[PDB]
């Protein structure tokens, strides 16, 4: 009878970039989903496939918690069937996705005077990503018909670009921490019940 640790995902001192979002496993827990949904401290809380309204009586094999940080206008992009730079090059969700998406403001923690440029996103890629695909390549992007020879000159760009977060920006340009909960149900252990 041990409760799930969500102080390691939500109460995390450091979050990950959108192109390098972090993932952790939760198992053998008494996780209750009513506490988070009834905390009155989260801006966005949307669940697809399952309903959060007192459905904390389900068992699953495993729980995947995926955390990262984006800007406000991109928070709507973390959803099935969404399009954009983040949705196509950084983070992707399956069309038949079942799970929950939680998002809360982080201006008071992830914004700095003069610009905090520690968060990066991929701007160019040869093709879109697959669901749950994580790319950390640094190969330069050839926008022309000539080889770039590994240098960033004309029609040769660095595919990764850094966000600029300042406390005086609007809510659409402020940082926002996003956590996606995904549930796995295999044909044996079902160790994540949380009565």
């Amino acid at each position, epitope marked *: 009878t041990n409760l799930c640790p969500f102080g390691e995902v939500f109460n995390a001192t450091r979050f990950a970039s959108v192109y390098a979002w972090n*993932r952790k*496993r939760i*198992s053998n827990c008494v996780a209750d989903y009513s506490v988070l949904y009834n905390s009155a401290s989260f801006s966005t809380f949307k669940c697809y496939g399952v309903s959060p309204t007192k459905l904390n009586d389900l068992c699953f*094999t*495993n729980v*995947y918690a995926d955390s990262f940080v984006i800007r406000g206008d991109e928070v709507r992009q973390i959803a099935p069937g969404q399009t954009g730079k983040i949705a196509d090059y950084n983070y992707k969700l*399956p069309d038949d996705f079942t799970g929950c998406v939680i998002a809360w403001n982080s201006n008071n923690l992830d914004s700095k005077v003069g610009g905090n440029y520690n968060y990066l996103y991929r701007l160019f890629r040869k093709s879109n990503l*697959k*669901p*749950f*695909e*994580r*790319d*950390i390549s640094t190969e330069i992007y050839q926008a022309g018909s000539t080889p770039c020879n590994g240098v960033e000159g004309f029609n040769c760009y660095f595919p990764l670009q850094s966000y600029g977060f300042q406390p005086t920006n609007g809510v659409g340009y402020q940082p926002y921490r996003v956590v996606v909960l*995904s549930f*796995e149900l*295999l*044909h*044996a*252990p079902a*160790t994540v019940c949380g009565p």
Partner: antibody
Amino acid sequence: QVQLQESGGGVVQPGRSLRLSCAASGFTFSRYGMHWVRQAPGKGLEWVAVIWYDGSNKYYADSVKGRFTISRDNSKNTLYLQMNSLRADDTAVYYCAKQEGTYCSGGSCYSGLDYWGQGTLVTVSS
Amino acid sequence: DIQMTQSPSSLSASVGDRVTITCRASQSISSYLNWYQQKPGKAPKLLIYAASSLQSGVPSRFSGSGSGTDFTLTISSLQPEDFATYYCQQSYSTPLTFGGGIKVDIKR
């Protein structure tokens, strides 16, 4: 009760072809990537080929490139391998492997192999 | 390609000791490493994935650590059923490569 069963092993003469199958039960086959592993008698494990969850990209080892073809039939819940121009270095036990995690499972649709079959013995001799 | 090296190729230990196994690589693979067991005449099955994450059902004494090019695995307790051969696999890019293999035997 997650299970994988392989079939198709036997004895074949060099220069011929063979076709191996593995059937799975206990999970949704259409959302996972699949791998082939082979172990020669008395030596270690060797990775052969990989196919993704939707079959878009298929990849092979250098020692079997141009001769081996991997495929998946998730409408019948099975995975197939075709071996051509077989030689004496292809005698081994074959395992059909299911990786941990759904879709790309955290990176480039490659992850650790969570479930394994019992394997089939394939012998090439004259 | 990426070559994965395991030295030594054999190991001898007695019940109650501490066992450490090391896997090495030739390029940077970040944390895409997996550890497998195998008893003779049986399927391998998985012990640790992501180079630091345990599996469901395995006894809670195996611990994996490391990132970059060198990784290590620790047993911390030997049991009669903890005698097998261990392998490390990289899952960064194709072709995926296994290791040579290390075998744990009985000291005498």
